[PDB]
mmCIF file with all atom_site columns, C-alpha atoms in Angstrom:
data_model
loop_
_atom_site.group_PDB
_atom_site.id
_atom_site.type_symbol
_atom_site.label_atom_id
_atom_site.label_alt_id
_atom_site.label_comp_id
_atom_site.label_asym_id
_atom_site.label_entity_id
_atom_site.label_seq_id
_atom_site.pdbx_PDB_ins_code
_atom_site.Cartn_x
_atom_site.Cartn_y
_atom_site.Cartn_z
_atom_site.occupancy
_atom_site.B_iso_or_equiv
_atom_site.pdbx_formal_charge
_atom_site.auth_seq_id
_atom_site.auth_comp_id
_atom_site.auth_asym_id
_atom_site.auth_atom_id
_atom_site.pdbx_PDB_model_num
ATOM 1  C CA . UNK A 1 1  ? 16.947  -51.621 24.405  1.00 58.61 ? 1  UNK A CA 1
ATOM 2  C CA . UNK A 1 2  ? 18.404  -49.233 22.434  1.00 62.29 ? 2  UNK A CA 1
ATOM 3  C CA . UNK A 1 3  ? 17.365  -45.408 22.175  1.00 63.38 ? 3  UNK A CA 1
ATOM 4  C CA . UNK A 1 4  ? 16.011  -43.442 19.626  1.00 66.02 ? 4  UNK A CA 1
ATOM 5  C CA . UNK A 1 5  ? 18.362  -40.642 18.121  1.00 61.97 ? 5  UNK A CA 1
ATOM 6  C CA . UNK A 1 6  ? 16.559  -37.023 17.165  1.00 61.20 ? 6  UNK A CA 1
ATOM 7  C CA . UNK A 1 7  ? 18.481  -34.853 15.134  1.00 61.42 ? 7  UNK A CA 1
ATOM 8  C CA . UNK A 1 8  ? 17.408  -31.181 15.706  1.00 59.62 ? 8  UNK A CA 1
ATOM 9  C CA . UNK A 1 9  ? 17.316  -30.783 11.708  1.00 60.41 ? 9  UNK A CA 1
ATOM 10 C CA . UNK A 1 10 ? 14.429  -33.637 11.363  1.00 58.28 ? 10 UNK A CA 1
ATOM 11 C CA . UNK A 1 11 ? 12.347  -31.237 14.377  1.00 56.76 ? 11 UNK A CA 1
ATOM 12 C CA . UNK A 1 12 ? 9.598   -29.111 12.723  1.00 58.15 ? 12 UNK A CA 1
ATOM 13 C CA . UNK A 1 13 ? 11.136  -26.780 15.703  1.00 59.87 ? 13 UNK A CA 1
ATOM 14 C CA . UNK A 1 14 ? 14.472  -26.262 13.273  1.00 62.03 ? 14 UNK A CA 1
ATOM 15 C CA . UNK A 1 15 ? 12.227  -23.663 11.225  1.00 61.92 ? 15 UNK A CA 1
ATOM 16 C CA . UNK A 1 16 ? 12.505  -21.450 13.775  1.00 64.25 ? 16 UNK A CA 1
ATOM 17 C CA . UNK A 1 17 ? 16.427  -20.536 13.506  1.00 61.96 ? 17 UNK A CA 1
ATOM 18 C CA . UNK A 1 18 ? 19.298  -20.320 11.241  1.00 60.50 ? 18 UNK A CA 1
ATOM 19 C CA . UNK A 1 19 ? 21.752  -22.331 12.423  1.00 62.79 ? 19 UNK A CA 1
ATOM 20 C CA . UNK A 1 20 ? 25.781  -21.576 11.809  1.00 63.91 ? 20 UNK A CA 1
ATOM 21 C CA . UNK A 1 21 ? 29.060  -22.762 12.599  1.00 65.51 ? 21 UNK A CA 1
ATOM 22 C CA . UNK A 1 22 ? 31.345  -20.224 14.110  1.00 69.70 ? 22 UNK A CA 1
ATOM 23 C CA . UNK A 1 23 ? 34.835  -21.939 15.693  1.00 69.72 ? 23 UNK A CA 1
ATOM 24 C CA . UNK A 1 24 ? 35.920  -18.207 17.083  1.00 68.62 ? 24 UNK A CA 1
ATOM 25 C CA . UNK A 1 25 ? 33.230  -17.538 19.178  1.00 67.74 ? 25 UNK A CA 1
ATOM 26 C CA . UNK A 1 26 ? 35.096  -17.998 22.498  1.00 66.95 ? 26 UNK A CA 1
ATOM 27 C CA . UNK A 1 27 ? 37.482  -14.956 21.296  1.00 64.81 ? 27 UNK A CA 1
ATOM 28 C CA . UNK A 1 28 ? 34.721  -12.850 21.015  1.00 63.61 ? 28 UNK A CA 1
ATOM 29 C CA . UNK A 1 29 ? 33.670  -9.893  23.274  1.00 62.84 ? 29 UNK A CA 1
ATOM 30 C CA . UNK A 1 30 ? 30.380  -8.249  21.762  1.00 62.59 ? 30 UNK A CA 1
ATOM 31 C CA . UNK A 1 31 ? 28.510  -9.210  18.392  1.00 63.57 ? 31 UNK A CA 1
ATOM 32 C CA . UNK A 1 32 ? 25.953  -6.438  16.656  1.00 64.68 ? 32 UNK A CA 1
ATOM 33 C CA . UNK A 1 33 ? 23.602  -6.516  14.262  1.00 65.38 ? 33 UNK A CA 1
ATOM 34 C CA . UNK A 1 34 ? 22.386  -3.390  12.201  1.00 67.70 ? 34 UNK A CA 1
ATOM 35 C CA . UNK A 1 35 ? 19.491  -2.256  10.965  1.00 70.18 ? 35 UNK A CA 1
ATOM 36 C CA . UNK A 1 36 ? 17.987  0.368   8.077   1.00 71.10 ? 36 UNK A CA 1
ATOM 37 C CA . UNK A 1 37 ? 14.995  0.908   8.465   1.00 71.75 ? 37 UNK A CA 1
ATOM 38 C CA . UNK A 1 38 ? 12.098  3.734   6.311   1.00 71.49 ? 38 UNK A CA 1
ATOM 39 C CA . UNK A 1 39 ? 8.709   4.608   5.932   1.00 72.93 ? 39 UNK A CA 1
ATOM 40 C CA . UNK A 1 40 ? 6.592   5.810   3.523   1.00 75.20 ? 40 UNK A CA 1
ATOM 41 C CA . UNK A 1 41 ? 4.626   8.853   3.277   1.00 74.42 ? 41 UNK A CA 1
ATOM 42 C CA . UNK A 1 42 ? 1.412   10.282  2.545   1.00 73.89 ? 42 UNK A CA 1
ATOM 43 C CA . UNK A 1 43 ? 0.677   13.975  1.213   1.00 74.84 ? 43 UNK A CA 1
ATOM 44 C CA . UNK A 1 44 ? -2.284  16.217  2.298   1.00 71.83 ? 44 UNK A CA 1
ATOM 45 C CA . UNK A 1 45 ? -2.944  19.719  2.298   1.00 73.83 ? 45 UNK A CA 1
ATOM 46 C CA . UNK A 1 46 ? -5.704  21.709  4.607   1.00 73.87 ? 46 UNK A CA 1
ATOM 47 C CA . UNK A 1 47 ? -4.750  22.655  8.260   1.00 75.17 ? 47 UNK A CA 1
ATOM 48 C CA . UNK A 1 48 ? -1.691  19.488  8.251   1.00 73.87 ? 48 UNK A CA 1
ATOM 49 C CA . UNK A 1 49 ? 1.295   19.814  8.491   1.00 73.85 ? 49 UNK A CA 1
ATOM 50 C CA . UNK B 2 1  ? 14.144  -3.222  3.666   1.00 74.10 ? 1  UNK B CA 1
ATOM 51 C CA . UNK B 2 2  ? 13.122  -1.997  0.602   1.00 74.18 ? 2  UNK B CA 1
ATOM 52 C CA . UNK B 2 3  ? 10.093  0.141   0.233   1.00 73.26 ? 3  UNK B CA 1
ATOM 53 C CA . UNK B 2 4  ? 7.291   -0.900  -1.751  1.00 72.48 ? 4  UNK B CA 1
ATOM 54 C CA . UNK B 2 5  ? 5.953   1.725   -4.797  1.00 74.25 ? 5  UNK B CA 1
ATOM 55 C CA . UNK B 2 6  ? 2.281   1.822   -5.187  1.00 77.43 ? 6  UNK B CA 1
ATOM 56 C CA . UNK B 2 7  ? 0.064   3.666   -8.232  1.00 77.13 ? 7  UNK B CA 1
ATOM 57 C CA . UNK B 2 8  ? -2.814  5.053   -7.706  1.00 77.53 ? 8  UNK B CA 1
ATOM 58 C CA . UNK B 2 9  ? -4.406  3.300   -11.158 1.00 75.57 ? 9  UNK B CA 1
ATOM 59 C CA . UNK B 2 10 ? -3.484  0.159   -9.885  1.00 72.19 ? 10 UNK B CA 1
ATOM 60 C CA . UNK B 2 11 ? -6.106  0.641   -7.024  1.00 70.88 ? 11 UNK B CA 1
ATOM 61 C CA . UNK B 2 12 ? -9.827  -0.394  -7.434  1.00 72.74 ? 12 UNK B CA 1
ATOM 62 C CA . UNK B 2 13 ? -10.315 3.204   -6.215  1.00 75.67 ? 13 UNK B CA 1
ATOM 63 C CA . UNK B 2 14 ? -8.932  4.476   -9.599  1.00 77.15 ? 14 UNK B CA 1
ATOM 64 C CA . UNK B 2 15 ? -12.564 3.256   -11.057 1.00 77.26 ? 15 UNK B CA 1
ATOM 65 C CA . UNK B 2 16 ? -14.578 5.748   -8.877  1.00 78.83 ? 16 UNK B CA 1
ATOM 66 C CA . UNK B 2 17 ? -12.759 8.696   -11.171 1.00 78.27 ? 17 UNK B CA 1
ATOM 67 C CA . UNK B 2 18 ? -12.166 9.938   -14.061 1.00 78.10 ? 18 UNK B CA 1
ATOM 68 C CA . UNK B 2 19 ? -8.593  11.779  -13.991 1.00 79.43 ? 19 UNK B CA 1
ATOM 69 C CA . UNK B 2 20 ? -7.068  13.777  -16.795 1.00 78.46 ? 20 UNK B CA 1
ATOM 70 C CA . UNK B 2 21 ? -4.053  16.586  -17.141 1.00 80.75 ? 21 UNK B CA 1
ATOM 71 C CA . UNK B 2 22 ? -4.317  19.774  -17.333 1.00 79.54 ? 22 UNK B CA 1
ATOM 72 C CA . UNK B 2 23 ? -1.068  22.271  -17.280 1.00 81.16 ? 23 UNK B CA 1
ATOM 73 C CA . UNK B 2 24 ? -3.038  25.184  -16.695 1.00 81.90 ? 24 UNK B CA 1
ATOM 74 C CA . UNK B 2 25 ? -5.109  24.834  -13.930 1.00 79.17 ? 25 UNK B CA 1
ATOM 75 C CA . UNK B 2 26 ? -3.868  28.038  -12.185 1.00 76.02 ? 26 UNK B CA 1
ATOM 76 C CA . UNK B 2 27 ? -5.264  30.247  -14.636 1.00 76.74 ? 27 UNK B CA 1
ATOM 77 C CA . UNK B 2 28 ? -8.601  28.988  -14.435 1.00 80.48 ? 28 UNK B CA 1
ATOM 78 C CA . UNK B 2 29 ? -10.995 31.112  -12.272 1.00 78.21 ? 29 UNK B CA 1
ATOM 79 C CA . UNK B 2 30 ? -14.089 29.468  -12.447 1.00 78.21 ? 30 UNK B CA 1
ATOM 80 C CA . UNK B 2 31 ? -14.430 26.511  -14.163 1.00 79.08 ? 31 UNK B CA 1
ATOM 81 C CA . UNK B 2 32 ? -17.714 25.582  -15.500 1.00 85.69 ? 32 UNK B CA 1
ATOM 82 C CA . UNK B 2 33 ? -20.010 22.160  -17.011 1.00 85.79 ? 33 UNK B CA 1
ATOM 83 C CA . UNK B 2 34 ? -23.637 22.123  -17.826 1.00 86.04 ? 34 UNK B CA 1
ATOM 84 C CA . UNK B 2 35 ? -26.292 19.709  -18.113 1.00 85.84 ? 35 UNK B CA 1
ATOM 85 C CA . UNK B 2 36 ? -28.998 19.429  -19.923 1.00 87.05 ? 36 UNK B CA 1
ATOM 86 C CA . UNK B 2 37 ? -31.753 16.908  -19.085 1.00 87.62 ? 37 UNK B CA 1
ATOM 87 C CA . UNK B 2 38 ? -35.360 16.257  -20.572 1.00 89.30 ? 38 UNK B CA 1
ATOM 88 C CA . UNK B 2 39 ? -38.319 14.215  -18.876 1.00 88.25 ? 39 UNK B CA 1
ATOM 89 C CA . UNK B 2 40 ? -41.268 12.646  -20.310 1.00 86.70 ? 40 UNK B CA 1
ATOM 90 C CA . UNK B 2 41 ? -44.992 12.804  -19.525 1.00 88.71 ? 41 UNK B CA 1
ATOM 91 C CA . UNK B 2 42 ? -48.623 11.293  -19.842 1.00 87.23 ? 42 UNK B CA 1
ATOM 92 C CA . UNK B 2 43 ? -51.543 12.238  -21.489 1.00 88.53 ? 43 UNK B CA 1
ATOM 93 C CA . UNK B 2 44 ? -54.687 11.624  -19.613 1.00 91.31 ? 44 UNK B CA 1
ATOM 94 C CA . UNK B 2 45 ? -58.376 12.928  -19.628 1.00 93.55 ? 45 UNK B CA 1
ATOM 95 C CA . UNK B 2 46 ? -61.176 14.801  -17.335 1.00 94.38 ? 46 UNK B CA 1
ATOM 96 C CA . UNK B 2 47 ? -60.860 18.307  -16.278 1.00 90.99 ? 47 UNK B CA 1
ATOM 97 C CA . UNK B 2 48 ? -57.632 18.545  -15.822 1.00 87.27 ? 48 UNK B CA 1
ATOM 98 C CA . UNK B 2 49 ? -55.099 21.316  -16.678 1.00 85.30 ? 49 UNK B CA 1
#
């Protein structure tokens, strides 16, 4: 017999992440990732601050 | 993220109003509208005023 090859592309699974090549990632320490986040705001009057 | 800008026309709220400018609101002490409504009636008989 002779098997069946899945490529993880074809999966409906492969939705779920972004996949990317990175050779130097056994030189690195610690990776971040930022974020900016606001909010909007609403103006009243009366006993509110 | 960018925030999202909402006006207040654009609402289906902006239909339960009738909004209009007016600079000098501050100098108005008592602001004032009138109405001025008539009603019908019946004639009948018997001894009635």
């Amino acid at each position: 017999n002779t098997l069946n090859f899945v490529r993880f592309l074809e999966l409906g699974l492969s939705v779920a992440c972004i996949c990317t090549k990175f050779p130097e990632l056994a030189y690195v320490r610690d990776g971040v990732i930022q974020f900016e986040v606001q909010q909007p705001m609403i103006a009243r009057d009366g006993p509110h601050p």
